[PDB]
């Protein structure tokens, strides 16, 4: 009910997902994914996840910069495609938009089980906890627990990163 801000942010999230899922030129795909990452950062911020949303925004910005470089290197064409320069891309974009519209309408105006279960809406504010205590952020404490509780996770993650470096070097060798 209250300003439905997170609803608008999630709708823009879905819109960006449709934008890069209709698969125009990878430049515009990366632009759509950047928009989706930003609005998802905002969504996560609205529920108290400042660190996680900001971190995913930073990570996807770096990834999309690398993707832009690679698109200019190896994914170009003489006429890069936009959402209105091709019948298939435009049709996919319109179909995604109208599917999201139909889902939203059938969701808020009556109660139906789309795929998993049903829901009425009422905004996100209802499911909150109104807990009142603390000189810390529980998200920050849980994330910092990785270095005291999650030793196993740190070990497997570091091994996977080193192996990933070795793997990319093995793959890009050629011969």
């Amino acid at each position: 009910m209250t300003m439905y801000i997170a609803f608008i942010l999630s709708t823009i999230f879905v819109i960006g997902f449709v934008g890069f899922s209709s698969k125009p030129s990878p430049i515009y795909g990366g632009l759509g994914l950047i928009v989706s990452g930003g609005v998802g950062c905002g969504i996560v911020l609205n529920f108290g996840g400042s660190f996680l949303g900001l971190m995913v925004f930073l990570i996807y910005l770096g990834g999309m910069l690398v993707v832009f470089g690679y698109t200019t290197a190896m994914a170009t064409e003489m006429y890069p495609e936009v959402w209105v320069s091709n019948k298939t891309v435009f049709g996919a974009f319109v179909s995604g938009l109208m599917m999201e519209f139909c889902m939203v309408y059938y969701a808020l105006k009556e109660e139906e089980v789309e795929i998993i279960f049903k829901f009425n809406g009422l905004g996100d504010w209802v499911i909150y906890d109104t807990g009142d205590s603390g000189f810390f952020s529980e998200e920050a404490m849980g994330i910092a627990a990785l270095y005291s509780y999650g030793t196993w996770l740190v070990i497997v993650t570091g091994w996977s990163l080193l192996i990933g470096v070795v793997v990319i070097m093995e793959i890009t060798r050629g011969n």
Partner: protein
């Protein structure tokens, strides 16, 4: 009343950028045995106004091969992000008080590169494309080292809150504890703002105008304002991070003055560096950042993780 504060932030920043252009021209003139602008107004004080009025009364042109939407969007993104970078800076109080201000500035800075990339790509010109690829290379060069340097420096602060840096430096400047990291951070900010000797993206001697070669008039002026505002913001952030000014809660104007002089000194230091050195090759920049800065940065990150534990000097506020 909050919009009044937003305006009182943004408008003086634009005026400061306008007069920073003149300060650059005069300083580089005097280091080159000349005077620089001294005719348009007394001591050239009216030169920025004439420049702005000329630029915004000149015809802007759309390239025939250009992609129009991204072409128009990129300068808007650049200027808006340059203005947005100032809101968490405590001078001594911030307009927006954030728990994580440093990482927010990191994310916004990372997003700012896409203005350069998208302008270069949407110009649909060879020189602009070369400039955009050089920007990709520059970000790949500096990003990781800059972030780890921020981590190592802020380990002694105790949090990512920008206003805590004043309390951390109540008795001594942080530089007296992390001056190697300070030097590497200074070079990283030189690379991050596309300033000489790392002004690779424009590449005027080599690429004529680089990424913004197609741009003319008002759109060009916004790119210029965004770059200069980013320079001032980065120098102010460096002043907060490494040169802590004493803050009196009952007299914040003293802190404001001290802050302004320090950031002006750092901006003049950039100007001096531009007047002093030749330009790097853009592969040499990445080799410098990945073979010299990155190893020292990793070692100093280890050292600054270990030091508070060894000396029982861990800061508060988990």
């Amino acid at each position: 009343m909050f919009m009044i504060n937003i305006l009182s932030l943004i408008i003086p920043i634009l005026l400061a950028v306008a007069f920073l252009t003149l300060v650059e021209r005069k300083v580089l003139g005097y280091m080159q045995l000349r005077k620089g602008p001294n005719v348009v107004g007394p001591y050239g004080l009216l030169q920025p106004i004439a420049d702005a009025l000329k630029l915004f009364t000149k015809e802007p042109l759309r390239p025939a091969t250009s992609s129009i939407s991204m072409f128009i969007i990129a300068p808007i993104l650049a200027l808006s992000l340059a203005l947005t970078m100032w809101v968490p800076l405590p001078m001594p109080y911030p307009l927006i008080n954030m728990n994580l201000g440093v990482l927010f500035m990191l994310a916004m800075s990372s997003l700012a590169v896409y203005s350069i990339l998208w302008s270069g790509w949407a110009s649909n010109s060879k020189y602009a494309l070369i400039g955009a690829l050089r920007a990709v290379a520059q970000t790949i060069s500096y990003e990781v080292t800059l972030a780890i340097i921020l981590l190592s420096v802020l380990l002694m602060n105790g949090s990512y809150t920008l206003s805590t840096l004043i309390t951390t430096q109540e008795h001594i400047w942080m530089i007296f504890t992390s001056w190697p990291l300070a030097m590497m951070w200074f070079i990283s900010t030189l690379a991050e703002t596309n300033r000489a000797p790392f002004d690779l993206t424009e590449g005027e001697s080599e690429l004529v105008s680089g990424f913004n070669v197609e741009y003319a008039a008002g759109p060009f002026a916004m790119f210029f304002m965004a770059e200069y505002a980013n320079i001032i913001m980065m120098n102010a952030f460096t002043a907060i991070l490494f040169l802590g000014a004493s803050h009196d809660p009952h007299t914040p104007e003293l802190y404001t003055i001290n802050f302004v002089l320090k950031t002006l000194a750092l901006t003049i230091t950039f100007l001096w560096i531009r007047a002093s050195y030749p330009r790097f090759r853009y592969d040499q920049l990445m080799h410098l950042l990945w073979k010299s800065f990155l190893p020292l940065t990793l070692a100093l990150c280890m050292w600054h993780i270990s030091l508070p534990i060894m000396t029982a000097s861990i800061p508060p506020q988990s």
